[PDB]
Structure formats: structure tokens, C-alpha cells
Nucleic acid binder design. Sequence first.
RNA 1: GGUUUCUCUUCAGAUCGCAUAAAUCUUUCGCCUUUUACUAAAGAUUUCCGUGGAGAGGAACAAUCUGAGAUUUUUUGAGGCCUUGCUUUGGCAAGGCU
Length: 67
Amino acid sequence: IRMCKDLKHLIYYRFNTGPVGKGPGCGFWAAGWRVWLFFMRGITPLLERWLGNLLARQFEGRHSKGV
RNA sequence: GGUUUCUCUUCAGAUCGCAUAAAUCUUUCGCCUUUUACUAAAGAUUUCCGUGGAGAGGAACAAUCUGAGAUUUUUUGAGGCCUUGCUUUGGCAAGGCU
Ligand SMILES: O=P(O)(O)O[C@H]1[C@@H](OP(=O)(O)O)[C@@H](OP(=O)(O)O)[C@@H](OP(=O)(O)O)[C@@H](OP(=O)(O)O)[C@H]1OP(=O)(O)O
């Protein structure tokens, strides 16, 4: 989130330079899109393992003593 | 001595990736009632998103294509001839010849 905020500042202070002002008209979404896809690369196996454990506890049942 | 595409197997020691996430363990910090979820540095490992080389099989298209392959100076007649020793009998070593 912090990286995205920093990127926005960078983009805005390369955008609002000449006659353009502080309007909401700047949409240059490639950098934040890159950041959230690299996050999604990292968060795919962790969420896969977590939801697999959730489904296995939902269907196989919870081991009482177990480990 | 074809291209394109799909799948499988094997090897990566190249910035395998002119990009970059996450997790585990051991310690140091910070926040701090306690536990997750946390802070950010190191080390040891992993997973994931991708990649390169080689081989094999399949499918669709061009059906070949791409190759490798002489006289006029200095590289051709200034060529033949008797004698002495050896003849090693194809001639060698020495003289005036043309
Ligand atoms: O720095 P942030 O906290 O991330 O807020 C910014 C900032 O607004 P603030 O100055 O008030 O903090 C920008 O403003 P500028 O200084 O660059 O002019 C910009 O606002 P502008 O559109 O007017 O440039 C942008 O706004 P937005 O993302 O809507 O485009 C956004 O403000 P927000 O946090 O409200 O979104």
C-alpha cells in the first residue's frame, strides 16, 4: 500500500507539471497494477494452502487431539 | 539439408528474470498485558509467477527449401657432344666445344 502511494506521488508530480492542474484526470494505472500482480504472485500459494486446509477441515472434520 | 503449433522427458552451473512476491526456522531490534496479525535487519532454507538448452511424440501448412561444390629474362628447353678415373654400365666427378 505504501509503495502504491509512493508511486502515485511520482506519477502525479510528473503529470501535473505544465498547464495541467490538481484535477482528478490522471489515470496511469500500470505501476499499481504491476504491484498488485506481484503481490498476487506471492499470495497465491499461501491462500491456496489456507483454503485447502479450510476445505479439508470442513469435509474431513477436525482432528481432536491429532498432532 | 522445411515452417508453425501442442504435449512429454531430461539438463540449467547465464542479470536462468535488464523484473521481482510470499512463507518456514534461528537471532537481533521496534510496538508491546498475552496470542495471531505485526516492525526491519542478518543468516539458513522453500513455495509460487515466469525462463533457457537438448531429445521424443503428435497436428496443420509449403512440399520443395537451404547448402558445399607455352614460349618475350625468375616455374619451363642452352639443348647435345669427345677425353681421364670409377664404371656404381641409368651415369658421377673434371676441359675446350657448340
Ligand atoms: O498525499 P496523499 O495523502 O496520498 O493525498 C493525495 C494528495 O492530496 P493531499 O495534498 O491533500 O495529501 C494529492 O494532492 P496534491 O498535493 O498532489 O495536489 C492528490 O490530490 P490532487 O488530485 O488534487 O492532486 C491526491 O488526490 P487523488 O488521489 O484523488 O487524485 C491524493 O489525495 P487523496 O488521498 O484524497 O486521494
